[PDB]
Amino acid sequence: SGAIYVGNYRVVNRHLATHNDWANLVWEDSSRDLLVSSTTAQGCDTIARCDCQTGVYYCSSRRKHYPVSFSKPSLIFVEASEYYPARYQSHLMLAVGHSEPGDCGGILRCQHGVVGIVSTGGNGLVGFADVRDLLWLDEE
Ligand SMILES: Cn1nc(C(=O)NCCc2cocn2)c2ccccc21
Ligand SMILES: [Zn+2]
């Protein structure tokens, strides 16, 4: 589990969005596993605007914060889960790290702010859905 809170926006894994998030839907993309909903209160998270490939992510399955190098976002074939059939996921960044399904929503951060959230993993990899291209998140 986990969310990004910036202005009056909540960013979650699409597969972990609630009844309430769909009712308050701003924007979603199945191929990115991203959903954004409106909030009452103002969030305190800053979105990174950069092309950083180094950072730190939270791993709930280890209660630890791991420093990693990650690839630039791309279209990547991802195997089936509970939530999606085997498919191509877009805007996905991979790193060498431990992850399990419940680690989804863990935040990846660089010196500039929040980069993305855990979405994919296994075989010693972790996949992050990038949010740095969603410039509209910093306004309105
Ligand atoms: C970080 N992590 N996430 C999942 C997962 O099932 N994601 C569901 C969402 C999804 C995206 O594309 C297909 N399914 C996973 C599975 C084994 C090990 C680590 C893992
Ligand atoms: Zn950065």
Side-chain angles (χ1 to χ4, degrees):
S1 64
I4 309 159
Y5 302 90
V6 49
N8 287 277
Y9 294 128
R10 165 179 147 93
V11 190
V12 279
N13 296 88
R14 183 183 184 266
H15 79 275
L16 294 186
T18 63
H19 156 122
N20 204 61
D21 287 317
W22 284 104
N24 288 314
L25 177 70
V26 169
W27 174 83
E28 54 85 19
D29 182 315
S30 182
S31 86
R32 289 186 68 155
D33 186 35
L34 280 188
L35 184 146
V36 178
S37 54
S38 54
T39 66
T40 182
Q42 300 238 246
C44 298
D45 292 327
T46 295
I47 310 299
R49 304 301 167 186
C50 63
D51 64 352
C52 285
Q53 290 190 242
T54 56
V56 184
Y57 83 98
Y58 180 62
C59 177
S60 78
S61 73
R62 295 281 177 270
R63 293 185 192 126
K64 286 217 166 56
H65 297 262
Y66 289 115
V68 290
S69 313
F70 50 91
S71 57
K72 295 183 178 192
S74 338
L75 193 63
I76 312 289
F77 191 67
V78 176
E79 289 302 331
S81 70
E82 264 203 70
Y83 300 99
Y84 300 94
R87 76 214 214 295
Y88 287 88
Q89 180 152 333
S90 67
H91 298 258
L92 182 55
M93 300 173 289
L94 303 185
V96 182
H98 178 73
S99 69
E100 300 177 30
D103 289 324
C104 285
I107 291 171
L108 180 78
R109 4 166 54 86
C110 63
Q111 61 189 89
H112 305 100
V114 171
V115 175
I117 55 163
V118 171
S119 178
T120 78
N123 307 5
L125 301 179
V126 57
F128 310 91
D130 186 51
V131 300
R132 293 175 288 177
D133 69 318
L134 308 168
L135 313 185
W136 56 265
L137 279 171
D138 301 329
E139 73 213 31
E140 146 62 52

